[PDB]
């Protein structure tokens, strides 16, 4: 259940991000945003609540709020399990104004289901609250996300935060001696020089998708993670993006077949993007959380809280030894 919704949510977010900025790199963590919004829904009731759950792509005629929260509790436990092969961690936290009293049911559920520890913070000292949240994210992301919070309105009552850290080694690592500056074509006639990594003579999952005019390959990390790489033919990127969905992803995976490949060329690169998700959440039906009709009463016992802003930042580093990727989501909440 949670798996299907989280994938549906991933591709819906992707499509909206591409719409907003058609010419930009994209990098985000769907699981971080889903978990942060599910955390928020722990404190929601009535229309505010049902909008979030449906915006996260859950079918409430087949699931309930308690089952959704248990799904996320189990997901967080599974992701944070020890591994000798891959570094993977996800944390949640809430930064709460010192003079504010919270429902015991919320504080207890947030700990038990989301592993969240509350942090008393003086939001009226913006620069202290700002560094306090940013240090927590910076530390959780091993230094990769440093400025998740750019501005904090002084009347902020609470900020919910999720971060994810991912660091893995390739099953088949690249040799840096084989990394050479080469062209990366931004368009059919414009290029930039980048370090191009290469592997030689390898057998990997492969699928030439003639229906969508793209090539799919799968590169494994050591541990339970892998990466699907999709290469549209020239001028076919938009056509492929339009076909992204759980069914297309399932079709690609079911069509992959091991195949010997003479040469694989992949850039060494690092990219980051920072997002204001207010627009996209609005388009998914998550609206009442942002208005005076906001019902976050399950947090303090009163309908006196409203979301002001949801932000997301993510960083992806791809290199010869493996991949490092990190992201965090923050939900800013003010008095209603």
């Amino acid at each position: 259940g949670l798996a299907s919704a989280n994938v549906d949510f991933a591709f819906s977010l992707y499509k909206q991000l591409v719409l907003k900025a058609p010419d930009k790199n994209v990098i985000f963590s769907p699981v971080s945003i889903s978990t942060a919004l599910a955390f928020l829904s722990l404190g929601a009731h009535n229309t505010t609540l049902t909008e979030i759950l449906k915006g996260l792509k859950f079918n409430l005629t087949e699931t309930s709020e308690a089952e959704i929260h248990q799904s996320f509790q189990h997901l967080l436990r599974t992701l944070n399990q020890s591994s000798d092969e891959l570094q993977l961690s996800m944390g949640n936290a809430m930064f709460v104004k010192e003079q504010l009293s919270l429902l015991d049911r919320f504080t207890e559920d947030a700990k038990r289901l989301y592993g969240s520890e509350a942090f008393a913070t003086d939001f009226q000292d913006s620069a202290a609250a700002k560094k306090l949240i940013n240090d927590y994210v910076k530390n959780g992301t091993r230094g990769k996300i440093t400025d998740l919070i750019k501005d904090l309105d002084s009347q902020t009552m609470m900020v919910l935060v999720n971060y994810i850290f991912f660091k893995a080694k390739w099953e088949m690592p690249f040799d840096p001696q084989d990394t050479h500056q080469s062209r990366f074509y931004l368009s059919k006639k414009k290029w930039v020089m980048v370090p191009m990594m290469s592997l030689h003579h390898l057998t990997i999952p492969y699928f030439r998708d003639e229906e969508l005019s793209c090539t799919v390959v799968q590169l494994n990390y050591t541990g339970n993670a892998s990466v699907f790489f999709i290469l549209p033919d020239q001028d076919k990127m938009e056509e492929v993006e339009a076909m992204l969905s759980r069914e297309t992803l399932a079709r690609w995976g079911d069509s992959l077949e091991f195949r010997e490949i003479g040469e694989l060329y992949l850039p060494k690169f690092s990219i980051s993007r920072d997002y204001n998700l207010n627009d996209i959440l609005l388009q998914l039906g998550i609206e009442e959380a942002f208005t005076s009709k906001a019902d976050l009463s399950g947090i303090t016992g009163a309908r006196n809280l409203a979301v002001s802003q949801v932000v997301h930042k993510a960083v992806l580093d791809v290199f010869e030894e493996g991949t490092e990727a990190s992201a965090a989501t923050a939900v800013k909440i003010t008095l209603l």
């Binding site: 992701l79 930039v192 090539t215 790489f229 290469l231 549209p232 694989l264």
Partner: protein, 34 residues
């Protein structure tokens, strides 16, 4: 013998093989884009 050359914009989907989570999703339109 075939060649796979990622020298134009491409997509990257990092997934957990088991929990089927998408950990990260990326489009690389310019590896040097500021």
């Amino acid at each position: 013998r075939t060649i796979v050359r990622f020298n134009r914009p491409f997509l990257m989907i990092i997934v957990d093989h088991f929990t089927w989570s998408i950990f990260f999703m990326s489009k690389v339109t310019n590896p040097k884009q500021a």
